[PDB]
Design a protein around this ligand. Structure first.
Ligand SMILES: O=C(O)/C=C/c1ccc(O)c(O)c1
Ligand SMILES: O=C(O)/C=C/c1ccc(O)c(O)c1
Length: 156
């Protein structure tokens, strides 16, 4: 089945700037997020169909995560990717999709809109715990991009 959740998050940074930073997330996230060590393009050119290997450290243990890039709408500050591999993905789960979109906040800031689509095998429902982890992963992504931008203002 497919189980669908939505979260939102605010920033002071405007969306255009924040979105350009999302594009460089493969180079940003390993710097600012401690667990993340690197992000390698394994197959593809960075566009839809691309597979990325993330290398995590979770309790002094090296783990891998595989992302599939699903779509990229730069007009709508949108970036959609799927977790398709690794330990972070549950054995009950076919895949987990992160659909991101930045939109304008009411003070010239921005609003991160996450739609999380958790694809299960058969009649399994998602684990309430792995939902907390998934939502948390998405926050840390956003905070990393935001942090990078605020710490490097001339960059964007
Ligand atoms: O966790 C959330 O609620 C939103 C996350 C989010 C939203 C938009 C982006 O461009 C992004 O990298 C992350
Ligand atoms: O939650 C995490 O720990 C890392 C998330 C992450 C890391 C690298 C990316 O390019 C991305 O879109 C998301």
């Amino acid at each position: 089945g497919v189980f669908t959740f939505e979260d939102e998050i605010t920033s002071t940074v405007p969306p255009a700037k924040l979105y350009n930073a999302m594009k460089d997330a493969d180079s940003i996230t390993p710097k600012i997020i401690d667990d993340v060590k690197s992000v390698e393009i394994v197959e593809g050119n960075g566009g839809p169909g691309t597979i990325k290997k993330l290398t995590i450290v979770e309790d002094g243990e090296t783990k891998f995560i595989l992302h599939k890039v699903e779509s990229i709408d730069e007009a709508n500050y949108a970036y959609n990717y799927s977790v398709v591999g690794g330990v972070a993905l549950p054995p009950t789960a076919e895949k987990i999709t992160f659909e991101t979109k930045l939109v304008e906040g009411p003070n010239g800031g921005s609003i991160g809109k996450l739609t999380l689509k958790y694809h299960t095998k058969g009649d399994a429902k998602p684990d309430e715990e792995e939902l907390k982890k998934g939502k948390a992963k998405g926050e840390g992504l956003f905070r990393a991009i935001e942090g990078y931008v605020l710490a490097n203002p001339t960059q964007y």
